[PDB]
C-alpha cells in the first residue's frame, strides 16, 4: 500500500 | 603527454568510497511517528545497487538523533584519502531541512557540515552525495493531465521530492524515489553521467507513480524528485 514520509 | 581535459571527477582511486545507509523504520513509541513500511525493501535495494558500483556499504538501522550525529562525525573523521567519493542515504520521516532520528529531529545541515571542504580534508575536491528519502513539507502535488574552493562545493543532494512536498512510500515495493533510483543506476551507471541518470529517475517518478488512497485528501497525487547540485565536475561511476 501507499502511504508517506 | 597529449592534451588533457579535467571535466570529470577522478573515480579511479583504489576505492570508490563509503555508502552509509541510515534506515529508520521504527520510531520511539514516545514520538508517535509511524513505522515506515517498505523501507527495508529500499535499504536492501540500495545495498545491492551500491555493492555493484563497488561502494563499501554500511547499513545502519533505527538510529536515534544522537546516534546519527555520532555516526556522521565518526565517518567524517576517517581517512578517505584512498576513496573517490562519499555517499550517504537517509531513509526516514522528515520535514524541510530535517531528517528524523528514532527519537526526534536532526538538521540536515548538521550532518552535511561534517563533510565540508574545510572540515573533511580527505574528501576535499571529491563528490559527496546525499540521497534523501523523506518528506520536505505537507504540500500535495495533484498533477496535470498529459587557490581555494568553496566549502560547500562538490556536494550533490538527491532529494526524493520537491521543496515543501510530501514524499511517497509503498509498503511492498519501497519508496517511489528509491525504487526508481536503484532501477536507473542498475541500467545506466555504466553508460551515463550521474545528472543524466538522476534526470531519468525524475521522469520515472513523475510518470509511473500516482498515489491510491481511500482518503480523498491523499488520493491521486504525484511526485517529482529534486536534484540539487553543487558539483563542479561530471560524475561517472565507471573509469577507463
Curated annotation (Swiss-Prot), chain B:
Tissue specificity statement from the Swiss-Prot or TrEMBL entry: Highly expressed in lung, spleen, heart, liver and kidney. Moderate levels in brain and skeletal muscle, and low in testis. Also found in many cell lines, highest expression in cells of the immune system.
Active site residues per record: 93, 135
S-nitrosocysteine sites (modified residues): 135
Top-tier EC class: hydrolase
The UniProt record lists the keyword Magnesium: no
SMART domains: CASc (SM00115)
Location in or out of the cell: Cytoplasm
Activation and inhibition: Inhibited by isatin sulfonamides. Inhibited by BIRC6; following inhibition of BIRC6-caspase binding by DIABLO/SMAC, BIRC6 is subjected to caspase cleavage, leading to an increase in active caspases.
One GO CC term, this protein: cytoplasm
Modification (Microbial infection) ADP-riboxanated arginine, positions: 169
GO molecular function: aspartic-type endopeptidase activity; cyclin-dependent protein serine/threonine kinase inhibitor activity; cysteine-type endopeptidase activity; death receptor binding; enzyme activator activity; peptidase activity; phospholipase A2 activator activity; protease binding
Mutagenesis or variant effect for residue 169 to A: Abolished ADP-riboxanation by C.violaceum CopC
Modification note: Cleavage by granzyme B, caspase-6, caspase-8 and caspase-10 generates the two active subunits. Additional processing of the propeptides is likely due to the autocatalytic activity of the activated protease. Active heterodimers between the small subunit of caspase-7 protease and the large subunit of caspase-3 also occur and vice versa.
Family membership: Belongs to the peptidase C14A family.
PANTHER family given in the database record: CASPASE, CASPASE-3
Subunit (UniProt): Heterotetramer that consists of two anti-parallel arranged heterodimers, each one formed by a 17 kDa (p17) and a 12 kDa (p12) subunit. Interacts with BIRC6/bruce.
Function recorded in the entry: Thiol protease that acts as a major effector caspase involved in the execution phase of apoptosis. Following cleavage and activation by initiator caspases (CASP8, CASP9 and/or CASP10), mediates execution of apoptosis by catalyzing cleavage of many proteins. At the onset of apoptosis, it proteolytically cleaves poly(ADP-ribose) polymerase PARP1 at a '216-Asp-|-Gly-217' bond. Cleaves and activates sterol regulatory element binding proteins (SREBPs) between the basic helix-loop-helix leucine zipper domain and the membrane attachment domain.
UniProt name for this protein: Caspase-3
Amino acid at each position: 500500500x501507499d502511504x508517506x514520509x | 603527454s597529449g592534451i588533457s581535459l579535467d571535466n570529470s571527477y577522478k573515480m579511479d582511486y583504489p576505492e570508490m568510497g563509503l555508502c552509509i545507509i541510515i534506515n529508520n523504520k521504527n520510531f520511539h513509541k514516545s514520538t508517535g511517528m509511524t513505522s515506515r513500511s517498505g523501507t527495508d525493501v529500499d535499504a536492501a535495494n540500495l545495498r545491492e545497487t551500491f555493492r555493484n558500483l563497488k561502494y563499501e556499504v554500511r547499513n545502519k538501522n533505527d538510529l536515534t538523533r544522537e546516534e546519527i550525529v555520532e555516526l556522521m562525525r565518526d565517518v567524517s573523521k576517517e581517512d578517505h584519502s584512498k576513496r573517490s567519493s562519499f555517499v550517504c542515504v537517509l531513509l526516514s520521516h522528515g520535514e524541510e531541512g530535517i531528517i528524523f532520528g528514532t527519537n526526534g529531529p536532526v538538521d540536515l545541515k548538521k550532518i552535511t557540515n561534517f563533510f565540508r571542504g574545510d572540515r573533511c580534508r580527505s574528501l576535499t575536491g571529491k563528490p559527496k552525495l546525499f540521497i534523501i528519502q523523506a518528506c520536505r513539507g505537507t504540500e500535495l502535488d495533484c498533477g496535470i493531465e498529459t587557490h581555494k574552493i568553496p566549502v560547500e562545493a562538490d556536494f550533490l543532494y538527491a532529494y526524493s521530492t520537491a521543496p515543501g512536498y510530501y514524499s511517497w512510500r509503498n509498503s511492498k515495493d519501497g519508496s517511489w524515489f528509491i525504487q526508481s533510483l536503484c532501477a536507473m543506476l542498475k541500467q545506466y551507471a555504466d553508460k551515463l553521467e550521474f545528472m543524466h541518470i538522476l534526470t531519468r529517475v525524475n521522469r520515472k517518478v513523475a510518470t509511473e507513480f500516482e498515489s491510491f488512497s481511500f482518503d480523498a485528501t491523499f488520493h491521486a497525487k504525484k511526485q517529482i524528485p529534486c536534484i540539487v547540485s553543487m558539483l563542479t565536475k561530471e560524475l561517472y561511476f565507471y573509469h577507463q
